[PDB]
Amino acid sequence: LYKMSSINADFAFNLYRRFTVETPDKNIFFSPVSISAALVMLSFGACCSTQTEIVETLGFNLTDTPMVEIQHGFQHLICSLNFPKKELELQIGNALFIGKHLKPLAKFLNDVKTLYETEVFSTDFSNISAAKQEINSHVEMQTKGKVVGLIQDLKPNTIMVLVNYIHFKAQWANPFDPSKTEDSSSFLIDKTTTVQVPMMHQMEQYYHLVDMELNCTVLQMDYSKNALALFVLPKEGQMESVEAAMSSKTLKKWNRLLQKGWVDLFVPKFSISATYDLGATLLKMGIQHAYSENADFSGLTEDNGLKLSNAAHKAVLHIGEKGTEAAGAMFLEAIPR
Ligand SMILES: N[C@@H](Cc1cc(I)c(Oc2cc(I)c(O)c(I)c2)c(I)c1)C(=O)O
């Protein structure tokens, strides 16, 4: 419901915080919905503690939201996100690359295809090089060329890869005039160091606030339809404290407090990318049995013949005068159990 949105948001912020620990004072950029979607999809085929660990790690309490409701919730979410929207490109889909010799349950396959935007491909993982290339170029195509080389290394014993992809392209409700963009303006990257970036500039009415508790400025920039960007600008030295406070509760607070008024606004034009090896992180967060010799994916294949081995994510962002283009992909790799 809006219950799910609250849970998924808090998962995003907790995972975000894990990243600030693994790569401190560095660019962070990921798609929470992509990561959550891949794991939920994996959970559809899992049983018992293997299944429950995955959803609990995603933030859910199975007393509050039974397994079945979580499944239906995520199927509804991905359907809604993919629903045609004028002036907005947003697609999120998944692909299952199944080994030639695996015995996937027709139930699992029919379910993910009908209910979870899944394309299924029979894959010859005995040519591990060609398989890696096939999967990479499919993710590349589905992300409109924006996510290149998702998979760097694929284990020779790989017998299944689950991939989720997201592509987003939208125009600002109020685009910037490139004739007002300063070619070269300073951006502070640490206390004593600046980099030069093009700085877009406009004066318009925007929803905004100063959080008096957190000492950050929050700025909402709408896209032309069904979407928005939130920029959170901490006071000097206050990034750590703002990061600690990010939560669904904090977003709900801001939603009430944001007020539309005139702002003389300067936003950088830039592109960034980020990659994450997620195997160890997901284990630490509580996904354990999925990796073990006693992994229970009895809902996926006839012979419960696999276990999770690797996971990784790549995401890219561009912001310019016209709008924003962002893409991401998540993969989970399985080997014989
Ligand atoms: N106020 C305008 C603009 C706005 C939309 C969203 I989406 C949002 O982000 C969240 C995220 C979660 I999770 C919530 O529970 C809530 I409430 C808002 C915020 I901040 C502001 C609107 O409503 O369209």
Curated annotation (Swiss-Prot):
Keywords noted in UniProt: Glycoprotein, Secreted, Signal
GO process terms (BP): thyroid hormone transport
GO molecular function, one term: serine-type endopeptidase inhibitor activity
Tissue: Expressed by the liver and secreted in plasma.
Phenotype upon changing residue 95 to P: Montreal/TBG-M; partial thyroxine-binding globulin deficiency
Record gene name: SERPINA7
Record field: transmembrane: none
GO CC terms, sorted: extracellular exosome; extracellular region; extracellular space
Statement: the UniProt record of this protein carries the keyword Signal: yes
Result when mutating residue 78 to N: Gary; severe thyroxine-binding globulin deficiency
Species classification: Eukaryota, Metazoa, Chordata, Craniata, Vertebrata
Localization per Swiss-Prot or TrEMBL: Secreted
Full-sequence range covered: 39 to 364 of 415
Main location (coarse class): secreted
Designated name of the protein: Thyroxine-binding globulin
Function comment: Major thyroid hormone transport protein in serum.
Annotated residues for binding of thyroxine: 255
Residues the record marks as carrying a glycan: 61, 78, 127, 215
Entry similarity comment: Belongs to the serpin family.
